[PDB]
Structure 1
């Protein structure tokens, strides 16, 4: 089994992982307490490589939902999904915590529910006989999800360090600063852990998110409850090599390893094209495969903020372009030929880059049976642009004298302020030294 145990943590990290499971139930066509169709084995050929294997003809996800506020998990028992999950082997109903908005609460709460936090992942791993890893779906948004998630990057990198560590971080909207004020602190605190307590991550941003939500989803005002729709689908899109047949890189640690050349450059930008429902009327005339990877190499679907004058002094190094559903697997070699003549992907000025192309067959569902799907998993060397945005609001904040002694009460009593600042400066420099 290539069972990955998801570590959903956080007020926002729970919800984006919640519709990740409901999506899998909508396309496998299942009841959340019974397997009522033959689409479970005809549609999908593995259904328990991320789920606990059938012993009642039913599938139980390999997810744990622990959080300081029991209120996000109490909203799972008002939906028919609290018998898809179980009452202690997924989540403990009424597991309290802090206030919680402090990072230093959640960091100390992993150090005293320390016994139970590594029994819940191993209660829910009694059929993993060869573990993939642990993916921490933990949000930076809120002090709840960033505090307890930063603890678990450390204890799972000292017992399972060669196994996958990979987080879906979402840095809260950096154009508010009177909604969240602890925002440069909780970001730089997890960012220290991504580079020496972790292998690879897949970063995201909220302020580059909502750009797309009004351009391809076309909502009237960004609010978190549509943001979770767009995230929950790219999480089921990235595992379509491991839940359906394949061979070359048919593991989730097969895809992600080949997007790393050097530590401190492994931050993957995510892009996903079929969010528009006006491409299902342009498939009666055929949407082609030639141009569906000419909008993946275009920067339009970018969920990580960055300049359009920082891609002329930087080039992409590794870019993976995943088609699902229709593809036509004889003209996919016709699709890559025209890439080099336009040059929509930049190539590193010290050797050839890499365009890895993949295809995968899927279960019947609407962007994998009527219309083309493109997942991008980019690797660009302009990723220091978020780190400069968070580090210039962190030292500015220290110039307003905020959280230098209103943060030293609970388990910070040394100078660790310059520890986040400098380790961020090693990252901002080492990327530029290895990129001309």
Structure 2
């Protein structure tokens, strides 16, 4: 019916998808090894849209996880949520990889394991006779997720041409350049494949993570154990129309169709306010829907590093405001009434704009059926500031003679560096041209 195959790949893409499947059992009322609660069918009306359909009421995840590093998968099998995963769909015990840290490693390893990489991931494709598409849950940081992920964006474009492609890709961190220095090279090589060899992306910045991780979360030493908490909730938040019973844009080709203006303009800004557990003691007094979307357009919950004074000459075109759970829908048109009076979104002068709001009932659970949740999927034309940030860090590195002799020994014979530079400037010029 609407079966999606997630493509978890890389050192960071496997960990953000590990707790994504772990989030799904707590809201479906199911255990990874059994069914102890009856809340799975009376409370939740649809479960076989991301999981594989049941053979013994055991909803297998439709997931594949490949990585060169064996460290990310050795921290999985000792956890009690790995018995839900199957040891025959992806790998058996003692799976390995390369050495290995290179963008050209996984780019060259795709055609030597070409027979095996297109054998076991295609067995899940013909399980349903109407496949939705493929989401590449991969990473941009490092050479593991960026090297091999650029290969599958090409060969799955023609072997599966009538399928939706859209990824939840995480952006790397640009604070210092000591541990990694190959960061401007492997990022722009995948970013070219994300626009012409891929339809849509969902950007997730790393410098904007610790802006939120010290905002309300109150940590002193930033660890990697907090990167899975902001990411796994908004992943399950994006499929609330798709997993839980909704009516309009209840498919993944429903939501993405109403937000993309044009190809190579698909970078969607994400926002998510409620992350604090001591808000729970004051939501008993009928906290309404009239105050939760006034702060979405206000740049506080954003996960995109952008300029603060660059929003006057940029214009919103498509903005999504997803409320979940208890909505009190007699005032949801009242919340959309107050949008035109502030004009917090700059509107495009050539065409109409749209503020789309939708709702779906959440899990039968006490932290879910009590507190209001707001998921934002914006589309603003100030996203070229990240593309100006990555390009200015790209041409400055090529004048310092950095990784021009250390990178072209394997499988690179011609200069494909300006092939990425002009196509990035094509994106940056067509964005500002789009508001005439």
TM-score greater than 0.5 by the shorter chain: yes
Distance 2:189 2:426 in 1: 15
TM-score normalized with structure 1 length: 0.97
Query: Retained in 1: the 8 A contact 2:29–2:38?
Result: no
Distance 2:48 2:306 in 1: 38
Distance 1:65 1:292 in 2: 37
Distance 1:198 1:270 in 2: 19
Deviates further, 318-327 or 345-354 = 345-354
Distance 1:336 1:197 in 2: 36
1:156 equivalent in structure 2: 156
Distance 2:197 2:94 in 1: 30
Query: Retained in 2: the 8 A contact 1:66–1:95?
Result: no
Distance 2:404 2:283 in 1: 58
Query: Retained in 2: the 8 A contact 1:64–1:120?
Result: no
Distance 2:101 2:433 in 1: 37
1:367 equivalent in structure 2: 367
Can you list the C-alpha shifts for 1:132-182, whole angstroms capped at 9, x where unaligned?
Answer: 111001011111011111111111111223421112221211112112211
TM-score normalized with structure 2 length: 0.97
Aligned CA-pair RMSD: 1.4
Can you list the C-alpha shifts for 1:193-245, whole angstroms capped at 9, x where unaligned?
Answer: 01110111111110012111111322223221101111011001000111111
Distance 1:308 1:274 in 2: 23
- Partner secondary structure for residue 346 of structure 1: coil
Distance 2:156 2:201 in 1: 14
1:395 equivalent in structure 2: 395
Query: Retained in 2: the 8 A contact 1:140–1:146?
Result: yes
2:338 equivalent in structure 1: 338
The 3 A distance-change label for structure 1 pair 43 and 90 is: farther
Query: Retained in 2: the 8 A contact 1:45–1:244?
Result: yes
How far the C-alpha of 1:98 sits from its partner, in A, is: 2.2
How far the C-alpha of 1:287 sits from its partner, in A, is: 1.5
1:133 equivalent in structure 2: 133
Q: How many residues align?
A: 436
How far the C-alpha of 1:304 sits from its partner, in A, is: 1.2
The 3 A distance-change label for structure 1 pair 272 and 365 is: farther
The 3 A distance-change label for structure 1 pair 366 and 274 is: farther
Deviates further, 385-394 or 85-94 = 85-94
Query: Retained in 1: the 8 A contact 2:324–2:361?
Result: yes
The 3 A distance-change label for structure 1 pair 366 and 359 is: same
Higher helix proportion (structure 1 or 2): 2
Unaligned runs of 5+ in 2: none
Q: Which ranges of 4 or more aligned residues in structure 1 deviate by more than 4 Å?
A: none
1:288 equivalent in structure 2: 288
Deviates further, 62-71 or 162-171 = 162-171
Query: Retained in 2: the 8 A contact 1:387–1:428?
Result: yes
How far the C-alpha of 1:365 sits from its partner, in A, is: 3.2
- Partner secondary structure for residue 357 of structure 1: strand
Distance 1:216 1:345 in 2: 26
How far the C-alpha of 1:104 sits from its partner, in A, is: 0.4
